[PDB]
């Protein structure tokens, strides 16, 4: 039970401090807040998503801030800090005034037009990419890794991100939307080195299949994904009574044989060696296949088989009758039990569809690998974000100072009370520049007013202050870049986010 | 509960001084001991930076956080944790002064680094490459032990130190996880510090007078049961089967008098005499009557050994391990040119000594057996790692602040950037260096100012590395003096000092929650 | 601290102020607890047991202090007493006195190491002229008056009154009976108090004195195969039945009858295991005893662990509960095993005395144990004040005469040495007057009178004080020339051990 202006305050109130301390933590140049547990447990992070947690949370809109944050933590995970900045910016500025000017409403609307102007300006301020040139992509990843200051192994993982994620990218609604991630498969591996890893075709099966009787290598036998229903039928097509006695053992187990084979001969109809048996797994099912000298890999996940559905690019087959390569094991394909470290790894490569690879990771060991993987995970996603979005923007204040002018130019032209949000919208761009001016550790009011001028003539197209260069700069020469969507994705959120709590005057239990 | 930014940094920097200050002699011979009766609530004695940290249950995050990274140096050097804390808060003292006047917390943290380099560059510049001899290591030994204990106490310690590492320098292993074998002994005085190029055997055999002086040591380190057990034991044990117990009574001493004969024959094979000493060491119990048979053969047959000792036995002697004594060649068992089975107190601690190809060298200390006897053991043992660094680095420079000024000089003597910006960081940065001699000199004596202008002008006049007389307060050529910084030690803690001081400068809030 | 942090109960005030005072109050207690004194200090045990002693460790052991300051040092007086007899009551007060000069130096603002070393420096200087203070040595450890001259001191160093016949009876106890050549035994020399008669009636029976009742017939033979048992007879019967008495009735008459010949069995098997005496940490069993009277096995109805200890100790015995026919493990040692009556109580006696296995067991008669205890306190020390294990002890003046000797000496040097080192070395030779001030109190005079003359007597190695009227006006006794002397040894220790901590205890501010 909470009300109105006090909500509206608690909106501005909480969302203020919500938007805040992690901006000290923001920037490649940053300030890590300390976090103390009531027991005395200490934490040092630049991660708001992490910072969101140990702090005791009460304000349910702060919980809701954690929501769009986690919601964004789901999407990128980076900028979850940066998304809640601007809503904090947004909710702070227009709300109290314009609610004391009596409305969420004109505030609500104008962020539609706060959104589009930049969305427009985004397509203007962001420039297309070569996803064709991975180096044109690499610098982004070279840029993506280094705000949290990780380079060492990532410098390679940068490239390896480029490689698979363009391949792990095959997806179409017919408008060809590519979100596809789960295709990309990663491998914890002991030994090798962080500077040695790769992407192997199909989907390499690492996690739950070490299984040594897969044989080892499949030259061109098929791998078989069973939504069969390979389960032995104790009768003709059915499962007869159990075996409590000698008579039920002879007759029933015999008919259990046929249904395995007749399907496994349908499996043989696509000629495998490896059959990874998921539905209809039977102790006779593998044994027959093992009697068939068909290695039947059981006690297995359909997630593996979904990895294997993306390992051969295939589907999994409920059809008992007439099992096919294109049914399961699409394409010639491979299957190989590989030891990277000594861990057995099934590698099912050569998906029937091209753009087939999945990321092998070697560190000097699992951990220093996990160093790669975690950062590669960021590296690899920026790809499918650049692969998502083949436009990208000179960052910092360039990203920031661009639209406010058009926005103010709107507010000036729009000259409503919607102009007031476009004023409230204008400088909210510049807070991370303030943080960037924090990042350099300089005088913001100057650099703002300075960068304000930098948009008066240059129009801050490439010109922000970059706290890490310290100065108002071209962000193209300087090379500050993100795929446009990510900018918007950070930008889209806070609008709706602010607009979200812009709706709430009422908490009620 | 929360404190923001400025209020956040205070609790940080404010927590440092008093904490930091207690250590103002933790280093060099002037270093003052500190006693926990309070750490777990137990009477103790310690000087080290990192160790004292972990020892006390230390409630404050400030106290908490560096001990984690202070663990690194104490892991690496073992000392200079006895040092590093001092520059750190003094560094913390410096940066605020700007922000006190005002300045952006970034740029100061920002201005430490080229500073952290140009000074580290000066380390490259100042580092004194030295060709390590036992004497050089003797004065390397005593500079870390002066940090620990009396230079007096550093003396009898120094011997075993540079001597133990002396046989590992043979091994060409720059680090020592062996010849780190240390022993403590019942005594009225912790003064005694003994050096066994071999090992020392804690357990005595339940039978005395077996071979009390083993001259030629032929050591089979044996897991063997020469006590299977003598009476009813079934698998060697009691059980619920009489039927099996009925069968299993006799083979026991048979399996034993086997291993008896397996030693009996072995002894006479190893020896053919009681003249050449001989040793059997069981990881488990042995029949004394086995021993009785064997104790009269010229063996010292030993029992219930500790698997750890077995190794240095298996290794420093080149010893061996079997489950059946069988017979083995005399040489087939590892060797120590002498074994001295030694009782001080009521327990014979057998010295298997000059163990052939020692990879391990045993350092006995006899003492009152108090945390006194502890305060000596820890003392040598980080100096061991310290002097180990002198094996590591060929560059050892003197301590006693001979480094600091000349290092603090340049970056102050010129803005290394010729930025105020960096010099903001740098002047903050390069200043904290002086904390060590300036307090120690004043800890021991006159105000820092003189020695400072001395040591500076001296270095300015000299360039020779001149450092405090750590119980006077006057600078003395610290190289010749022997108070000595491994280029390992100082460089690391340098990094350690700064690498923490930044993001902790960067804590602009702390919430109590989790 | 300022923060929530770490662990310390010393430092700041505590180190300077409160530790020194923690280094004070108990030394303050020990001041007339050492040396010739009429001071007496009541103490209750964990037993709540009212007792008086001028011995420290007794008092010490039950004292708890949040500081290590008072805490840690007392081990030294023990480390001392580990070495010798008293002088221990001197050990700490020597420290505490010389200590609080440093907090003054702390007021005067002298650095720790600056304060530290001059003592240590002069601690040598003490030990350096300490041999110059050897005015005699120990001639006949067999002689009574050779030894009694000494023994009087630690007793005196404990208490003034009873010292003489003690110092006599202790050599009449024949500390003689050992070479004390490096061979000396206070396991073979035990103080066993008979409660009864007088303490002037207290004797010394050479051979183990066990006031415990000699049970039944005396030893089978005097080289006693000894069965020392914690519980040799716990009873052989179990009465649990329908009623745990009778239900089927005749089943009762079996075991109460069948019990006793099992006690016979055990006792016969005491005669069968071969023990010339059986020893019961547990109870005697009467039939067994009667059987042991038949078998004439000497017995002890009940045995203290203390009994069993010395029993297990010296016999080579092992005290065991036995519900079984017994097994000699304990066997023998003592070649004469007797019954005595001293204070007219059955005294189980064990004597092998070889001059090496030689047992001279002091048997204290007295009508009070607290009496014979505070006695035994000084008696504890005299024997092990006698125990130097130098037959030649380089006898140095007793009673503290050597103090003023080096007061002049080392502060005259303390004069000569320069710097802040001076008062370090100077306060050092000032540490003596404490007890010459302390006992001067119980003596009844100020220490200036004492010390000015103790100074004006100058180099003596005799002239000194204590509890006396000689200790009052003259500031002169013979703490050498009267027969009151000291071994050279504990001196070095009473000097050194305290000097170490006083140095060390300050250096720790934690």
Curated annotation (Swiss-Prot), chain A:
Q: Where in the cell is it found?
A: Cytoplasm
Binding-site residues, Mg(2+): 78
Which residues are recorded as modified (Phosphotyrosine)? 232
Question: For binding ATP, which residues are annotated in this chain's numbering?
Answer: 27, 79-81, 396, 467, 482
Q: List the disulfide bonds.
A: 351-357
Modified residue annotations for Phosphothreonine: 415, 444
The record's keywords, sorted A to Z, are: Acetylation, ATP-binding, Chaperone, Cytoplasm, Disease variant, Disulfide bond, Hydrolase, Intellectual disability, Isopeptide bond, Nucleotide-binding, Phosphoprotein, Ubl conjugation
InterPro entries from the UniProt entry: Chap_CCT_gamma, Chaperone_TCP-1, Chaperonin_TCP-1_CS, Cpn60/GroEL/TCP-1, GroEL-like_apical_dom_sf, GROEL-like_equatorial_sf, TCP-1-like_intermed_sf, TCP-1_chaperonin
E.C. number(s) listed in UniProt: 3.6.1.-
Write out the catalysed reaction: ATP + H2O = ADP + phosphate + H(+)
Among the GO molecular function terms of this UniProt record, one is: protein folding chaperone
Residues with the Phosphoserine modification: 155, 228-229, 237
What residues bind ADP, as annotated?
A: 27, 79-82, 147-148, 396, 467-468, 482, 487
What's a BP term from Gene Ontology annotated to this protein? protein stabilization
List N6-acetyllysine occurrences by residue.
207
Q: Which family does it belong to?
A: Belongs to the TCP-1 chaperonin family.
Q: What is this protein called?
A: T-complex protein 1 subunit gamma
Curated annotation (Swiss-Prot), chain B:
Q: Which residues bind Mg(2+)?
A: 79
* Reaction(s) catalysed by this chain's protein: ATP + H2O = ADP + phosphate + H(+)
Name the residues that bind ATP.
Answer: 28, 80-82, 400-401, 485, 490
Phosphoserine PTM sites in chain numbering: 194
Task: Provide the leader sequence positions.
Answer: none
Q: Give Gene Ontology CC terms.
A: chaperonin-containing T-complex; cytoplasm; cytosol; extracellular exosome; microtubule
Q: Where is this cross-link: Glycyl lysine isopeptide (Lys-Gly) (interchain with G-Cter in SUMO2)?
A: 240
Q: Where in the cell is it found?
A: Cytoplasm
Q: Where does ADP bind?
A: 28, 80-83, 147-148, 400, 485
**Self-association or partners: how does it assemble?**
Component of the chaperonin-containing T-complex (TRiC), a hexadecamer composed of two identical back-to-back stacked rings enclosing a protein folding chamber. Each ring is made up of eight different subunits: TCP1/CCT1, CCT2, CCT3, CCT4, CCT5, CCT6A/CCT6, CCT7, CCT8. Interacts with PACRG.
Descriptive protein name: T-complex protein 1 subunit zeta
Q: Write down the species.
A: Homo sapiens
Lineage, top ranks: Eukaryota, Metazoa, Chordata, Craniata, Vertebrata
UniProtKB/Swiss-Prot annotation, chain C:
Q: What positions are modified (N6-acetyllysine)?
A: 305, 387, 453
Its cellular-component GO annotations read: azurophil granule lumen; cell body; centrosome; chaperonin-containing T-complex; cilium; cytoplasm; cytosol; extracellular exosome
Look up the EC number in the record and give it. Answer: 3.6.1.-
Q: What is the uppermost EC class here?
A: hydrolase
Protein origin, superkingdom: Eukaryota
Which positions does the record annotate as the modified residue Phosphotyrosine? 17, 492
Catalytic activity annotated for this protein?
Answer: ATP + H2O = ADP + phosphate + H(+)
User: What is said about its interaction partners and assembly?
Assistant: Component of the chaperonin-containing T-complex (TRiC), a hexadecamer composed of two identical back-to-back stacked rings enclosing a protein folding chamber. Each ring is made up of eight different subunits: TCP1/CCT1, CCT2, CCT3, CCT4, CCT5, CCT6A/CCT6, CCT7, CCT8. Interacts with PACRG. Interacts with DNAAF4. Interacts with synaptic plasticity regulator PANTS.
PANTHER family associated with the record: CHAPERONIN (PTHR11353)
Q: What is this protein called?
A: T-complex protein 1 subunit theta
Q: Which organism is it from?
A: Homo sapiens
């Amino acid at each position: 039970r909470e009300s109105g202006r006090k909500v509206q305050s608690g909106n501005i109130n909480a969302a203020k401090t919500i938007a805040d301390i992690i901006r000290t933590c923001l920037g490649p140049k940053s300030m890590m807040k300390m976090l103390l547990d009531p027991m005395g447990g200490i934490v040092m992070t630049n991660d708001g998503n992490a910072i969101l947690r140990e702090i005791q949370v009460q304000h349910p809109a702060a919980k809701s801030m954690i929501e769009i944050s986690r919601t964004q933590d789901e999407e990128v995970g980076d900028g979850t800090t940066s998304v809640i900045i601007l809503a904090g910016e947004m909710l702070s500025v227009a709300e109290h005034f314009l609610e004391q000017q009596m409305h969420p409403t004109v505030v609500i609307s104008a962020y539609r037009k706060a959104l589009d102007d930049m969305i427009s300006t985004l397509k203007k301020i962001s420039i297309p990419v070569d996803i064709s040139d991975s180096d044109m992509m690499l610098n982004i990843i070279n840029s993506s890794i280094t705000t949290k200051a990780i380079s060492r192994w990532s410098s390679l993982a940068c490239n390896i991100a480029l490689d698979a994620v363009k391949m792990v990218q095959f997806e179409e609604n017919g408008r060809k939307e590519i979100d596809i991630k789960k295709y990309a498969r990663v491998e914890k591996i002991p030994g090798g080195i962080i500077e040695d890893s790769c992407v192997l075709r199909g989907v390499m099966i690492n996690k739950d299949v070490t299984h040594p009787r897969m044989r080892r290598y499949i030259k061109n036998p098929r791998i078989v994904l069973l939504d069969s229903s390979l389960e032995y039928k104790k009768g003709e097509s059915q499962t007869d009574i159990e075996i409590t006695r000698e008579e039920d053992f002879t007759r029933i187990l015999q008919m259990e044989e046929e249904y395995i084979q007749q399907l496994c001969e349908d499996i043989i109809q696509l000629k495998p060696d490896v059959v990874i048996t998921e539905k209809g797994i039977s102790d006779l099912a593998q044994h027959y296949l093992m009697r068939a000298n068909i290695t039947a890999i059981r006690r297995v996940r359909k997630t593996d088989n979904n990895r294997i559905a993306r390992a051969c690019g295939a589907r999994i087959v409920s059809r008992p009758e007439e099992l096919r390569e294109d049914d399961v094991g699409t394409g010639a394909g491979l299957l190989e039990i590989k030891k990277i470290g000594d861990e057995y790894f099934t590698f099912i490569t050569d998906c029937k569809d091209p753009k087939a690879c999945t990321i092998l990771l070697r560190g000097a060991s699992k951990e220093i690998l996990s160093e790669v993987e975690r950062n590669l995970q960021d590296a690899m996603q920026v790809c499918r974000n650049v692969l998502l979005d083949p436009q990208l923007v000179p960052g910092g204040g360039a990203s920031e100072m661009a639209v406010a002018h058009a926005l103010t130019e709107k507010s000036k032209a729009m000259t409503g009370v919607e102009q007031w949000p476009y004023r409230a919208v204008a400088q909210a761009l510049e807070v991370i520049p303030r943080t960037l001016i924090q990042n350099c550790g300089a005088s913001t009011i100057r650099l703002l007013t300075s960068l304000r001028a930098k948009h008066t003539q240059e129009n801050c197209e490439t010109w922000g202050v970059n706290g890490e260069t310290g100065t108002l700069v071209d962000m193209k020469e300087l090379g500050i870049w993100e795929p446009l969507a990510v900018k918007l994705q950070t930008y889209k959120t806070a609008v709706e986010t602010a607009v979200l709590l812009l709706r709430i005057d009422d908490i009620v239990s | 509960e929360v404190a923001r930014a400025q209020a956040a940094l205070a609790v940080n920097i404010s927590a440092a001084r008093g904490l930091q200050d207690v250590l103002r002699t933790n280093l060099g011979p002037k270093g003052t001991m500190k006693m926990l009766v309070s750490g777990a609530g137990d009477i103790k004695l310690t000087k080290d930076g990192n160790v004292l940290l972990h020892e006390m249950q230390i409630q404050h995050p400030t106290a908490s956080l560096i001990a984690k990274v202070a663990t690194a140096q104490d892991d690496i050097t073992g000392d200079g944790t006895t040092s590093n804390v001092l520059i750190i808060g003094e560094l913390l003292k410096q940066a605020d002064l700007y922000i006190s006047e005002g300045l952006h917390p970034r740029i100061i943290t920002e201005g430490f680094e080229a500073a952290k380099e140009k000074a580290l560059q000066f380390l490259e510049e100042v580092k004194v490459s030295r060709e390590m001899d036992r004497e050089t290591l003797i004065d390397v030994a005593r500079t870390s032990l002066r940090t620990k204990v009396h230079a007096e106490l550093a003396d009898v310690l120094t011997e075993a130190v540079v001597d133990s590492i002396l046989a590992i320098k043979k091994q060409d292993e720059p680090i020592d996880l062996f010849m780190i074998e240390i022993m403590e002994m019942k005594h009225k005085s912790e003064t005694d510090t003994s050096l066994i190029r071999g090992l020392v055997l804690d357990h005595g055999a339940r039978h005395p007078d077996m071979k009390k002086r083993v001259e030629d040591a032929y050591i089979l380190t044996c897991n063997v049961s020469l006590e299977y057990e003598k009476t009813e034991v079934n698998s060697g044990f009691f059980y619920k089967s009489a039927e099996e117990r009925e069968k299993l009574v006799k083979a026991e001493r048979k399996f034993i008098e086997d291993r008896v004969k397996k030693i009996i024959e072995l002894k006479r094979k190893v020896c053919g005499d009681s003249d050449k000493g001989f040793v059997v060491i069981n990881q488990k119990g042995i029949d004394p009557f086995s021993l009785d048979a064997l104790s009269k053969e010229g063996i010292v047959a030993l029992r219930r050994a500790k698997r750890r000792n077995m190794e240095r036995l298996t290794l420093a002697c080149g010893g061996v391990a079997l489950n059946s004594f069988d017979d083995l060649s005399p040489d087939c068992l590892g060797h120590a040119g002498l074994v001295y089975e030694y009782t001080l107190g009521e327990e014979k601690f057998t010295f298997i000594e000059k163990c052939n190809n020692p990879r391990s060298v045993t350092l006995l200390i006899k003492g009152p057996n108090k945390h006194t006897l502890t305060q000596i053991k820890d003392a040598v043992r980080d100096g061991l790692r310290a002097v180990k660094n002198a094996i590591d680095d060929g560059c050892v420079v003197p301590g006693a602040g001979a480094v600091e000024v000349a290092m603090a000089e340049a970056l102050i003597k010129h803005k290394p950037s010729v930025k105020g910006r960096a010099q903001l960081g740098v002047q903050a940065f390069a200043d904290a260096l002086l904390i060590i001699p300036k307090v120690l000199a004043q800890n021991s004596g006159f105000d820092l100012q003189e020695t400072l202008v001395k040591i500076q002008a001296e270095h300015s006049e000299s360039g020779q590395l001149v450092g405090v007389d750590l119980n006077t307060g006057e600078p003395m050529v610290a190289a010749e003096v022997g108070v000595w910084d491994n280029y390992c030690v100082k460089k690391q803690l340098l990094h350690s000092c700064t690498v923490i001081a930044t993001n902790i400068l960067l804590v602009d809030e702390i919430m109590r929650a989790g | 601290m300022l923060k929530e942090g770490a662990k310390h109960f010393s430092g700041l005030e505590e180190a300077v102020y409160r530790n020194i005072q923690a280094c004070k109050e108990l030394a303050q207690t020990t001041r007339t607890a050492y040396g010739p004194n009429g001071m007496n200090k009541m103490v209750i045990n964990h037993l709540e047991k009212l007792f008086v002693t001028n011995d420290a460790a007794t008092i010490l052991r039950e004292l708890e202090v949040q500081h290590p300051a008072a805490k840690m040092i007392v081990m030294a007086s023990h480390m001392q007493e580990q070495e010798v007899g008293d002088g221990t009551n001197f050990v700490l007060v020597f420290a505490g006195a010389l200590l609080e000069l440093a907090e003054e130096l702390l007021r005067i603002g002298l650095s720790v190491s600056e304060v530290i070393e001059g003592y240590e420096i002069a601690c040598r200087k003490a030990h350096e002229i300490l041999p110059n203070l050897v005015c005699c040595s120990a001639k006949n450890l067999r002689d009574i008056d050779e030894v009694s001259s000494l023994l009087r001191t630690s007793i005196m160093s404990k208490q003034y009154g009873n010292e003489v016949f003690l110092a006599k009876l202790i050599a009449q106890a024949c500390v003689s009976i050992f070479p004390d050549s490096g061979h000396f035994n206070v396991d073979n020399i035990r103080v066993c108090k008979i409660l009864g008669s007088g303490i002037s009636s207290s004797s010394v029976l050479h051979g183990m004195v066990f006031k415990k009742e000699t049970e039944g017939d005396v030893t089978s033979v005097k080289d006693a195969k000894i069965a020392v048992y914690s519980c040799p007879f716990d009873g052989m019967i179990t009465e649990t039945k329908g009623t745990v008495l009778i239900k089927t009735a005749e089943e009762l008459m079996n075991f109460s009858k069948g019990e006793e010949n099992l006690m016979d069995a055990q006792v016969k098997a005491i005669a069968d295991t071969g023990a010339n005496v059986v020893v019961t940490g547990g109870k005697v069993a009467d039939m067994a005893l009667h059987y042991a009277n038949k078998y004439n096995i000497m017995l002890v109805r009940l045995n203290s662990k203390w009994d069993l200890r010395r029993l297990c100790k010296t016999v080579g015995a092992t005290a065991l509960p036995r519900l079984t026919p017994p097994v000699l493990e304990e066997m023998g040692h003592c070649d004469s095993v007797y019954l005595s009556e001293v204070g007219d109580t059955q005294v189980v006696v064990f004597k092998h005395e070889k001059e090496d296995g030689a047992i001279s067991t002091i048997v204290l008669r007295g009508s009070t144990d607290n009496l014979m205890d505070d006695i035994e306190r000084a008696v504890d020390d005299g024997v092990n004040t006698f125990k130097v294990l130098t037959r030649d002890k380089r006898l140095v003046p007793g009673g503290g005469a050597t103090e003023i000797e080096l007061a002049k000496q080392i502060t005259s040097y303390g004069e000569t040495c320069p710097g802040l080192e001076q008062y370090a070395i100077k306060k050092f030779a000032e540490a003596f007057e404490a007890i010459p001030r302390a006992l001067a109190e119980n003596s009844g005079v100020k220490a200036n009178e004492v010390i000015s003359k103790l100074y004006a007597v100058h180099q003596e190695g005799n002239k000194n004080v204590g509890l006396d009227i000689e200790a009052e006006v003259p500031a002169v006794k013979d703490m050498l020339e009267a027969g009151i002397l000291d071994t050279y040894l504990g001196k070095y220790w009473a000097i050194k051990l305290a000097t170490n901590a006083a140095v060390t205890v300050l250096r720790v501010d934690q």
